[PDB]
Design a protein around this ligand. Structure first.
Ligand SMILES: CN1C[C@H](Nc2cnn(C)c(=O)c2Br)C[C@H](c2ccccc2)C1
Length: 122
């Protein structure tokens, strides 16, 4: 287990950590490929969605959770974010615009998450 891995699993999120998480989340919200994920899926977008997707997630809900200091550990923040992309790929065909955006935006998140973990470790 690496130093960043130990911190990700074990280390309580501080206020300085939250400043970094806020920056990560805002960078996703500003990304060109974030348009599918800014607000909860509307049933009119896909009528069977909420009977299929058990744990919906979106960036506005994450923004609320970040402001309320919902997360105690980085793993929990990452798990909510990963739900956004996993739900999208679960429901949609791979040539859906939503699916293509999930692929790009998740790779962007992974880049930013790595930067955040490094900043936290030094
Ligand atoms: C709220 N709602 C969520 C939609 N995201 C969706 C819709 N349906 N399904 C099945 C999805 O996986 C996603 Br993500 C995108 C939509 C929009 C937003 C901007 C421009 C076009 C469409 C805004």
């Amino acid at each position: 287990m690496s130093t960043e891995d130990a911190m990700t699993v074990l280390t309580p999120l501080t206020e300085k950590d939250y400043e970094g998480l806020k920056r990560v989340l805002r960078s996703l919200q500003a990304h060109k490929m974030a348009w599918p994920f800014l607000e909860p899926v509307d049933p009119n977008d896909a009528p069977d969605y909420y009977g299929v997707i058990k744990e919906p997630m979106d960036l506005a809900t994450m923004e609320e959770r970040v402001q309320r200091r919902y997360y105690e550990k980085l793993t929990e923040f990452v798990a909510d974010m990963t739900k956004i992309f996993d739900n999208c790929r679960y429901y949609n065909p791979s040539d859906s615009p939503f699916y293509q955006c999930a692929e790009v935006l998740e790779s962007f998140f992974v880049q930013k998450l790595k930067g955040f973990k490094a900043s936290r470790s030094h």
